[PDB]
Amino acid sequence: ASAYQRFEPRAYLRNNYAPPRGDLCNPNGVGPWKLRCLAQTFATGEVSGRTLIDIGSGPTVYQLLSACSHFEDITMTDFLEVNRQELGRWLQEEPGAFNWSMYSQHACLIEGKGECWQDKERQLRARVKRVLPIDVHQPQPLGAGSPAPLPADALVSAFCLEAVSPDLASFQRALDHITTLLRPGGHLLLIGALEESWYLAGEARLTVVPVSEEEVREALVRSGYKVRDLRTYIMPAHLQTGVDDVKGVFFAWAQKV
Ligand SMILES: Nc1ncnc2c1ncn2[C@@H]1O[C@H](CSCC[C@H](N)C(=O)O)[C@@H](O)[C@H]1O
Ligand SMILES: O=S(=O)(Nc1ccc(Cl)cc1)c1ccc2c(c1)CNCC2
Numbered sequence: 001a002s003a004y005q006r007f008e009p010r011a012y013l014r015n016n017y018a019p020p021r022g023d024l025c026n027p028n029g030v031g032p033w034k035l036r037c038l039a040q041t042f043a044t045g046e047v048s049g050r051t052l053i054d055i056g057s058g059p060t061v062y063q064l065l066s067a068c069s070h071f072e073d074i075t076m077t078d079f080l081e082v083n084r085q086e087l088g089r090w091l092q093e094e095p096g097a098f099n100w101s102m103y104s105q106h107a108c109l110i111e112g113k114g115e116c117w118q119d120k121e122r123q124l125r126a127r128v129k130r131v132l133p134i135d136v137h138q139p140q141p142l143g144a145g146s147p148a149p150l151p152a153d154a155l156v157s158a159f160c161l162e163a164v165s166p167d168l169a170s171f172q173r174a175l176d177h178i179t180t181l182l183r184p185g186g187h188l189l190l191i192g193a194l195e196e197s198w199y200l201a202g203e204a205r206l207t208v209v210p211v212s213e214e215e216v217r218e219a220l221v222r223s224g225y226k227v228r229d230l231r232t233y234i235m236p237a238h239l240q241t242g243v244d245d246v247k248g249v250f251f252a253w254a255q256k257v
Pocket of ligand 1: 007056057078080083135158159160
């Protein structure tokens with residue numbers, strides 16, 4: 001955990017969201033695949049409501065592009081100060097913010113509702129109300145009196161749990177914890193690394209609990225969810241850049257029953 005004190009946002013974004021893993025031109029890339037999972041899920045029109053929380057958002061916004069048009073009150077979160085500060089730079093359009101234009105464009109492309117990418121970012125920024133600190137390890141992740149409207153109508157978390165858990169049991173608990181933030185009948189979109197044990201974030205060297213699709217499925221169940229969908233993306237050879245040892249990426253659509 002203390003390892004996350006040396007976690008550099010810019011280095012993290014450069015290792016995962018800049019070429020080649022960030023190139024969105026090739027359909028078979030992880031970028032295109034990921035945005036497509038989110039887009040298709042929301043297009044079914046079943047994941048809906050008023051509020052939505054992004055667990056461990058880190059310095060990224062992609063995971064909310066297709067979502068934002070379905071929830072008016074979006075709450076973003078993250079353990080690290082530096083990460084909330086990097087999100088702010090992009091939300092306020094301040095100088096030195098990360099450039100997600102390519103992602104917005106592609107999300108607009110995938111959705112195919114003829115929307116320009118500027119209207120997409122404008123809507124996301126508009127709907128994101130707050131950027132709160134969080135710790136999935138605490139039984140009440142956000143705290144006692146959190147500004148965030150609870151319980152949420154849906155949850156979204158990408159590459160957080162398994163990246164902050166030392167073993168399978170912590171992973172399981174952290175999932176039990178965030179599930180308390182979700183309203184019964186609510187929806188969870190969990191995205192993560194498959195069979196990953198480490199990944200670099202600049203000077204930081206984060207340890208990870210390698211998990212499998214089945215271990216993830218079982219976990220979602222043990223936490224009272226009905227797995228609506230679960231897909232896998234096997235990391236290609238040319239996307240093995242040395243910044244980690246991820247084997248694949250998983251996408252899960254679970255509904256709290
Ligand atoms: N105990 C904890 N509870 C919640 N988030 C935590 C945490 N410890 C670390 N984190 C955060 O979890 C994130 C994992 S990296 C994933 C970032 C982003 N969700 C993406 O899709 O790329 C980091 O931003 C890290 O600061
Ligand atoms: O899928 S990724 O290669 N990049 C990527 C994801 C999604 C899109 Cl839309 C584009 C690119 C990736 C993102 C985060 C993490 C890791 C890998 C492994 N380390 C833990 C964190």
